[PDB]
Amino acid sequence: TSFGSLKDEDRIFTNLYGRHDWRLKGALRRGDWYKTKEILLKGPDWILGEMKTSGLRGRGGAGFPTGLKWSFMNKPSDGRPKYLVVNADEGEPGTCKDREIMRHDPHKLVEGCLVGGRAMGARAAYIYIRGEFYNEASNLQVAIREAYEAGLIGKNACGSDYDFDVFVVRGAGAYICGEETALIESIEGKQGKPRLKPPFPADVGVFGCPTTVANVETVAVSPTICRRGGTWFAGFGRERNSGTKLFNISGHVNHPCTVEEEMSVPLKELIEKHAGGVTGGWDNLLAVIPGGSSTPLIPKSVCETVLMDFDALVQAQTGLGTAAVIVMDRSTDIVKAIARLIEFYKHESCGQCTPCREGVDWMNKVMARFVKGDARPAEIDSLWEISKQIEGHTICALGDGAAWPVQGLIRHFRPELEDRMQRFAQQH
């Protein structure tokens, strides 16, 4: 089984590069609001069963198994209403795969809000967008205006006996409000600080009311997981990790693209076939970051034989979140790159934990000293030790995503750091 083709009939994210009528009455031409009434009248448990038999996982930075994640609350009513929340925040660097479905088909996101919200059993879906995503939020509420004028949302959920609401909640510019619970506190109207998870969002979410948090792909391939697949979507990918993925290939390449493809495609094919190859050839293409920022590095020695599965990248000592293929070449500055990652995490991080207040700033100061080289090589393994002291010792996985490319840089690019210690030891 050597798949990774994804032929042009079986594309699941059509109208993505702009053409052929992104609004309503062109969205219904491409497949939207077609069998949605009988999808809602067939049953929510049938939609959750077609989530579980497809094996759709989390398309954000967590990779949590959906189906199971939405059957955390397949619950009867406890007095509170129920809500579906959409992380339209992107935040991780290199990751505008949600911006490209904000434009050119937000009606698929709106249909996914309605289908996933009645699949869990809910009242409203809150698409929370980033505070710099103004035209994206305006296109979202243009699609919400078209759906409400067509009568698809609100007391006739595509002409059914169901009431639903779809909102756009605008943020004000942080990556941390893309988290599963600082999402929730941002919509509740406070500092965007993530809650502790030992109360789950399925038990208490926004406003005290139980919620399901999902990413834009994680709700937006759902309304065509049930009008189009269930077993077809499970046939793509392997058994643990399945489906399609908006691969986001950026940095030092001749064609920077977002190509939607079959997941667990070779990364050789992701460089060469779609989004055509990097500058120079294959003397370059050292230091590929497979995901956005919560994935460590790869030293190009194993990168030719990398499958893009979650557990295969776990066995290849990384993770896979948003799958932003960030490519460096030999004409880069890798220590400046990862010190700019921890500069992003220092100037972004919400300041709640002790090992992300004064741990992330510590890693930023030591890696900013490692850029200039004016340190000694005895602190590289100590900075590795404080990276391992951050990892499981935080509230959210921004500590994980801040201490992981540190571990990738020490795991794969330690002799370049030793070369820079030699280069400063040449000076006086």
């Binding site: 007095g79 406070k190 809650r195 109360p199 005290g208 009311c209």
Partner: protein, 87 residues
């Protein structure tokens, strides 16, 4: 926020007078049992020690903390007034 002083019983005396020294304002006292604190492990043994030495005792019972119903899920309610606005 500790327990290790609250764990063992103690025996202090009545605090008598402590005047200023006429030389430089030191704490000059005539009560040599004023600096005495005696550790213990049980109230019955401390009461038996005070009976066997003959001093009159004032016994105060151990004010143990009642365990509170502190849950993180009650900090974020839908109807109750115990919502925290700080986070």
């Amino acid at each position: 926020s500790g327990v290790n002083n609250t764990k063992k019983w103690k025996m202090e005396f009545d605090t008598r007078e402590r005047w200023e020294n006429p030389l430089m304002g030191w704490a000059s006292t005539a009560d040599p049992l004023s600096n005495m604190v005696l550790t213990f492990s049980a109230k019955e043994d401390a009461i038996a020690f005070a009976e066997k030495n003959g001093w009159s005792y004032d016994v105060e019972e151990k004010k143990v903390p009642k365990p509170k119903s502190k849950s993180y899920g009650a900090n974020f309610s839908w109807n109750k007034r115990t919502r925290v606005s700080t986070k």
